[PDB]
């Protein structure tokens, strides 16, 4: 599969496997897990999206029972991984209340236990999960450079960040964050007008795009006739299509596909073979809003 | 009339005529085309404000036939034109849906089209429509540089673009945009407060402002009555009034009028005779808002 | 009580006392005056809060006949004063509406007046009291930059100005405006995730916060009940505990407390006393918001 360079220090696969239901599966055996990671492979999906919190702090160790019964399978993938949301879960079960935790002290202890369930010496991209409003952008900062320095971490980036976030923490570090992710899909458009996609585009950052299917909603009438019409017309399922618009945009959006169906996993790089034209960009785009695109502002 | 420098080589009168219902009148032969550009030069109205898109893709040509028959009158206005929406209409009917295109590709041949249109070599201003969410901001800066330095576009600028837009692309630019055309009335406010204004007035930048009247929607109580009690203060109609409360604001707002009436044309530069005051800027304003401005937090 | 430096040339103390009520109070005799002063010395607070227009224009003259017949009393206190709102009170009743006025000529004759009504050669800091939807940021910029020159003003800043307001009044300036006094408290939260408090933190400037204990409608359930269970586990009020939820925040905020109650002014360095811990702060916040922080998007 086509690689995306985030930086000159990270390259993923163009899309990447969000392993966040790992868990969920009743087979949870590193059989399991290995055959899921090489039905990924097998499309060229290299990269695996993790967050300590997954699984409520089991899903990167169930991985990690995969990766530890498979030499050489860590070295096959780029892991990413997230931190910095502390529920009342597994490790964190003393926690009293739901909260982030941004400080260098968590963020490192977050990582060690990544690394630990895992059974790997470094991650490839380590995110902040979400923005943080008692966020220490001097103490994250420094964290996140020290990480990065270290090796145990090869790149940086933020999750669910507004751009002023973006900016907060970028003031405070030495390293570029290299991405942003972010919902993104036919049925979440509004960062493709708020500024949000705007101040990553103007960074020349690609963001992740997390629920690029619309969460589940968008399969469940004018926008899935008119992605059933295209895929049809290109021999690709409703799906490859809604996947194909996000890789359409300039900005170099990164989909995030979370399935446990080795069917799906099997057919995700069908996105890849779909033209998406200008006019057909705006054909879904215009279903999804509900409205045409504003015309002349003299009429 | 006063004279507006946008950039050091960019000067428009400080009223434009705007041309978008010049194939609506019943009359577009050239010598009623004349006639309305020579009732704005009596006037010292020299700037005239186009659109490929106007009059579905055929009012630059209605312009177009009086100037090619009028020789010397090119050399007498300024000429603003915009390009980068797509409707299915005249010379775009194969278009499938209204979709936006500012590819160099479509920017060159839409330039190209005015020139044709319009029977000139030059157009002193290009602007790009509409903020396009599918804008690759490297590729459509690059055409915009390349315009400029080969003399057919004297400068560039962008309309409806929201600060993050302009941002974007001019972060891709090594010219500068020189204006941004948006809404602007006492029955269009937002752009004061919501931080539109304020960063085209921290850039140095003059906004064009269309439906400068409110769209009709004005004319059509407590706001009215202000504006002709100031009007008849001041030997004016009620429509001077409400431009002159456009031309007070220290961002150097340039109004775009859209009438095809001679007589609203013959009148037009009254808004300049207008002495509006800061406290008559606030009575108008408040009137429009509907409620007093924001007083002190403590009371 | 601990100082804030917010610039090298300006340091408050951590709580800052409100002045708004000075004038509300049926005795404004300087004996009065003077009691309420010494009450916020003996808790260390040295800095008062005053604005031109508290009082529709006579507060810092009530002030200011405290400080006359105190010799002395000037020097132990900081004073933070504000000017742009024409309201038609006192000397501006010849005032036709309620307008704002950033011109130097206004801001220099209410620095003087300032100055003439509490009997002092210099204020602390001055700020622009409201973002001005007509301002001129070049006449403002270089009328605050002669104050500062001028040592009539210690240093500047401004009020209720959203984060394209600073931007576009700091970019005309060459001293630094070293705060913004914005609503900040357990009931006015969306500074917290909306990107003004972000900018105030990514500048490393400390705001000022207004209203801190919610403007009276906090003490008028469960975020009640949780603020008396924390303060009576610490040994003081709940509204020593609504103030540290702000003193917590690592930008540095500066509540203003506006109280003529002598026995809440007693107090009002309890705040000190809390610790807060990141948890805490988060369960305040979240009963404030009145729903969870959004936690894995993933789920």
Redesign the interface.
Known sequence: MQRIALSDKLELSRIVY?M??IGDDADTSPAHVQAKIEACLAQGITTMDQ?D??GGYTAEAILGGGLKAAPGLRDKIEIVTKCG?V?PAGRHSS???????T?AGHINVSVEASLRDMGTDHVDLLLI???D?????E?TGKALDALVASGKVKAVGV??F????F??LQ?AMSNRLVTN?I?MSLLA?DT??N?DL??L??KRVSPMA??PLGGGSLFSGGTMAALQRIGKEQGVDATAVAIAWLL???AKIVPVL?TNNLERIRTAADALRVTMD??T???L??LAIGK????????
Chains 1, 2, 3 share one sequence.
């Not at 045409?292 to 009429?299: D, G, K, M, N």
Request: no cysteine.
């Open positions: 969000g966040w239901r967050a919190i997954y949301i529920a926690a009293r209340v739901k909260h982030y935790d400080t999960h979400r923005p409003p008692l966020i220490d952008a103490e999750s669910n507004r751009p002023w976030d900016s907060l003031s992710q919902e458009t493709f007008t500024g705007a101040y585009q103007e997390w629920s359409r945009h300039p979370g200008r006019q960009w705006f054909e785009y215009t045409e695109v504003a015309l002349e502002h003299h009429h």
